[PDB]
Each structure stands twice: as structure tokens, then as C-alpha cells.
Amino acid sequence: ILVVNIKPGMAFNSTGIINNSYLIKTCMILVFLSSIFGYCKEISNVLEWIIYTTGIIFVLPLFVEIPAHLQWQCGAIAVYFYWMNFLLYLQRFENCGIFIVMLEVILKTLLRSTVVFIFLLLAFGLSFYILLNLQDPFSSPLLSIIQTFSMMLGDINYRESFLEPYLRNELAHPVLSFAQLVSFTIFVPIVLMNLLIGLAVGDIADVQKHASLKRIAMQVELHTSLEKKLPLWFLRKVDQKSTIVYP
Amino acid sequence: LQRFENCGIFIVMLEVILKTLLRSTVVFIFLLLAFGLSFYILLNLQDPFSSPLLSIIQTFSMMLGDINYRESFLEPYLRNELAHPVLSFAQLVSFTIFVPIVLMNLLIGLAVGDI
Ligand SMILES: COc1ccc(OC)c(NC(=O)c2nnn(Cc3ccc(Br)cc3F)c2N)c1
Ligand SMILES: COc1ccc(OC)c(NC(=O)c2nnn(Cc3ccc(Br)cc3F)c2N)c1
């Protein structure tokens, strides 16, 4: 609410938006209380530290004036992680938890895999930094590595960065540059991406092998962790020994 | 067409994969809302992200791997028009790892598995 009712990058206070006062004051108070409650109640454990520590600084103006850049740099981080870490609450519903298990299993697999394939992209990134140096997408080695990482999705920019330069004699190394473009297209948009589809299809088919057990295992582990934590008199008040159904 | 011998199985497969994506969408609407509200801050002064609903549609269109990288990150950066330059690029690699690569391959995983 405190995002979508304020233009990003404008400073704000309870006293208003610098060019909704009750809304802004109450949403800031709720975020500040939710942050301090968070610290009291305190990768799941890491995300909660990021949200509370950063969610303070987005709402810090109510007490200490902070540059509008920090107010909304912290806000960009906090708002992102608030919704990402909401997925870890959705694991506690039967119709959501299996998808979020599949999403964590494929993420872990890609994060284990990318220690190898950073060097695969570093080779092409340092290579196109030489071959294409006089072009803005590749002006610097880090920009060239990001450009190569963007090309993994199959958007090569082939007409804008090879052929249009070549038909103007702007490519310093013309035959070597095309020869590297065909071999990049083979290794990265085809071979690496199909290896990640191969892993992802293989591993999700193994989660789906017991998914129907895994739902119920997650439910019993949820309920039993609550049954360990709730007070014994409450379980005795709440737990009837039998129930009727009327189909 | 479901009542013809040589059509009905494809429409049964269309039904199974559509239901599977719709059951998954309740979880992944919050995955795109994270990036959509994030890029609404990081790239607010660009027309694709002028409003939070436009930024969520833009992120949804980016799932197909058309990131608009030169048009919305690099060409602005080489003119100093990015308010948060380091944080904005760092979120662009993260979006690609979590949405065009992971989320789309998770759907190919489900789709292959069900057919
Ligand atoms: C593990 O590494 C392996 C494994 C199997 C391999 O062979 C298929 C290779 N070789 C190549 O990838 C390669 N061979 N030729 N080219 C063309 C070329 C190279 C440098 C420049 Br600059 C411009 C060019 F046109 C390549 N990209 C490497
Ligand atoms: C379920 O949620 C999970 C599960 C596993 C996770 O990590 C392995 C995470 N973490 C991230 O996605 C993340 N961590 N760092 N960054 C970089 C970054 C963040 C915000 C901004 Br704004 C700019 C940035 F560069 C991310 N995108 C969340």
C-alpha cells in the first residue's frame, strides 16, 4: 500500500509525500511494528533478517531523515523479499506446497550447476569483449558477461550486432566474429539451455514420483510440530475422538 | 472436436496441461508480483514500468525470455538514466535465473511429466 500510493523515488513522511497522510502514517506504523515484532519473534531464517532490517529503513523517515535514494533503495529490496518469502508461508497449504518444493528443488539444482557454467559464460564474455569491443553492448568486460548471460535466452541481437556492423565494415575481426556467433549459438542457447531443461524435467519427474505421499508427509509434519508446541490442556479440549460426515 | 477419434486425445492433453498451469498459478502470481513491484521501483522512469499494473504485465511478458535488456538496462545505463544502477542490473540477472530459466523449465517439467 505504501508503495503503490506513492511515486517511487519521492521522499515521504507521515506529514505527506514530498513533490494520503493517514494511510501513509498507519502503513508506516504497521511496517515498523511488524519489523520490531519480527526482531522479537526472531534460507528461510536469512530472508526474515533481510525483510525486517531493510523494512525499517524504508519507513525510517518517520524518525530520522534519510536521502530519498536510500529510502527507496531499501524499499526496492524489502518489497521484493516480502513477496518472495511469502512463498515459504504458502508451503503450508496442500495445493501449493508441492509446486514450491519443485521450485526449490530446481533452484537448488541450477545453483549447484552454475559453479561450472559461470566459466562457460566467462569464456564467451571475455571472447566477445575482444571481437565486438567497439559496440556499446560490449564496451566493458562485465557488460559483455551480462550481454552473454542475456543471450542465453536465445535473443542473440544477430541483426543489430553482427550483420548490420559487417555490412558497414565496423567488425574488426569479421570471419572470427561470425565463427564465434555460430559456436555460441550451439553451446549456450542450445546445449546449455537444453541441459537445464534435461535436469529440470528429470528432477521434477522424481518429485512427481511420490508427490502424493509428500503432500501428506508435509501435513503430518506440520500438525505434529504444532502438537509438540500447543499446551496439553488445549489438545484435550480440542481433539474429539470421533467425527460424523453427511455426504 | 473431443468427440472425434484422432482429435480427442490432444484436447485431453490440452485440458490436463491447462489445469496443471492454473493450479500452479496461485503460487507463481506472488513470484511475478515480487519482480513486478521490484522493477516498478528500480526502473520507474521508463514507460514500460510507469504504473504497477503495467510493470506486472511487463514482467509476465518477460517470462518468454524477451527481456528487452539493451532497450531497458544497458542503453539507459550508458546515458546515466538508471536511478539504482548496480541494484537494477543485479535484479535483472536474478529475474532471468528465477523466471525465464527456472519457472519456464518447471512448466516444461510438469508438461512433459503429465503428457
Ligand atoms: C570443453 O571445451 C570444448 C569442448 C569441445 C569443443 O569442440 C566442440 C570445444 N571447441 C569449441 O567450442 C570451439 N572450437 N572451435 N570453435 C570456434 C571458435 C573458437 C574460438 C573463437 Br574466438 C572463434 C571460433 F570461431 C569453438 N567455439 C571446446
Ligand atoms: C523463495 O525465495 C528465495 C529462495 C532462494 C533464494 O536465494 C537462493 C532467494 N533469494 C533471491 O532470490 C535473491 N537473493 N539475492 N538476490 C539478488 C537481489 C535481490 C533483490 C534485489 Br532488489 C536485487 C538483487 F540483486 C535475489 N534475487 C529467495
Side-chain angles (χ1 to χ4, degrees), chain A residues 1-236 238-247, chain B:
Chain A
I1 287 172
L2 193 63
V3 169
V4 306
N5 293 278
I6 307 184
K7 189 179 184 181
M10 296 300 96
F12 65 92
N13 297 98
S14 55
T15 55
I17 306 170
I18 293 152
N19 190 14
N20 292 327
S21 175
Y22 180 69
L23 173 155
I24 292 171
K25 187 176 174 72
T26 52
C27 295
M28 283 195 314
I29 286 167
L30 285 167
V31 169
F32 192 83
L33 265 56
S34 185
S35 303
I36 62 189
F37 296 159
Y39 283 113
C40 293
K41 193 167 72 173
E42 297 303 301
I43 197 169
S44 179
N45 298 320
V46 185
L47 304 190
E48 299 266 328
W49 283 119
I50 293 166
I51 293 156
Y52 302 138
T53 58
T54 314
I56 288 288
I57 306 165
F58 181 52
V59 172
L60 177 63
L62 70 85
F63 154 56
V64 163
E65 184 177 10
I66 253 301
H69 182 254
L70 188 74
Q71 198 195 11
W72 282 88
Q73 178 198 334
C74 295
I77 292 166
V79 175
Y80 173 68
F81 274 114
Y82 245 121
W83 285 106
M84 288 303 294
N85 185 56
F86 188 60
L87 302 178
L88 272 49
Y89 294 77
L90 298 181
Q91 282 185 318
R92 282 75 189 154
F93 300 105
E94 286 183 307
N95 298 314
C96 298
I98 195 66
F99 296 106
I100 301 152
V101 166
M102 291 183 296
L103 186 68
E104 204 70 23
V105 166
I106 191 180
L107 183 67
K108 281 177 178 289
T109 300
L110 179 63
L111 265 53
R112 278 184 171 267
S113 190
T114 196
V115 74
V116 180
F117 304 131
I118 278 286
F119 302 117
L120 175 63
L121 266 64
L122 188 69
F124 285 110
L126 272 285
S127 193
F128 289 124
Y129 174 54
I130 314 312
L131 296 163
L132 306 176
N133 184 36
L134 304 180
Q135 308 207 45
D136 291 340
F138 308 96
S139 300
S140 305
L142 182 57
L143 298 181
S144 185
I145 292 152
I146 302 144
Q147 176 61 67
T148 47
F149 176 76
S150 181
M151 289 166 49
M152 191 196 306
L153 272 44
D155 192 2
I156 303 301
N157 304 86
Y158 176 77
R159 270 197 201 159
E160 183 178 2
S161 267
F162 296 81
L163 184 131
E164 288 166 32
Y166 171 74
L167 298 177
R168 297 192 305 256
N169 309 83
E170 292 174 10
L171 289 188
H173 300 291
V175 173
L176 195 63
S177 183
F178 287 120
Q180 190 65 314
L181 190 278
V182 62
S183 55
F184 175 89
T185 299
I186 290 164
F187 267 83
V188 175
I190 297 172
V191 156
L192 183 68
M193 284 300 303
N194 294 351
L195 180 143
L196 297 183
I197 294 165
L199 295 174
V201 171
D203 299 347
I204 284 170
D206 289 345
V207 179
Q208 283 191 311
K209 188 178 180 180
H210 305 75
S212 183
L213 173 61
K214 183 57 178 180
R215 278 182 168 234
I216 313 299
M218 288 189 296
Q219 281 288 305
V220 80
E221 188 57 36
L222 188 287
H223 308 290
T224 199
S225 185
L226 291 174
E227 205 178 61
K228 282 175 172 178
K229 283 178 284 185
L230 287 165
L232 179 146
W233 73 261
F234 182 71
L235 290 313
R236 286 185 172 173
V238 167
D239 189 6
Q240 301 180 0
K241 308 303 180 44
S242 173
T243 57
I244 292 172
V245 181
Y246 304 90
Chain B
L1 299 185
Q2 284 216 268
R3 310 305 204 283
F4 289 121
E5 297 173 32
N6 299 305
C7 290
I9 198 70
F10 297 107
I11 302 147
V12 167
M13 289 185 293
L14 190 74
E15 175 173 80
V16 167
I17 194 178
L18 183 65
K19 283 175 177 288
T20 301
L21 178 61
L22 264 49
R23 280 183 170 267
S24 64
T25 59
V26 175
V27 174
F28 310 148
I29 203 77
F30 307 114
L31 177 61
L32 268 60
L33 190 71
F35 286 109
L37 276 287
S38 193
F39 289 126
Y40 175 52
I41 316 313
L42 296 163
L43 304 164
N44 191 74
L45 304 173
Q46 312 211 35
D47 293 351
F49 307 98
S50 302
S51 305
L53 182 57
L54 296 177
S55 174
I56 292 153
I57 297 143
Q58 176 62 70
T59 49
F60 171 82
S61 178
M62 287 166 58
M63 188 194 307
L64 273 43
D66 191 5
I67 294 293
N68 304 85
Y69 166 66
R70 295 187 185 184
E71 191 168 41
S72 269
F73 298 81
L74 183 128
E75 293 174 18
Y77 171 84
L78 298 177
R79 298 191 305 254
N80 311 94
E81 304 189 349
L82 284 192
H84 307 90
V86 178
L87 194 62
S88 180
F89 272 70
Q91 188 64 309
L92 190 276
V93 54
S94 294
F95 171 88
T96 309
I97 284 154
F98 269 72
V99 175
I101 297 159
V102 155
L103 198 69
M104 286 299 302
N105 293 351
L106 180 145
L107 292 187
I108 296 164
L110 269 38
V112 169
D114 311 3
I115 294 169

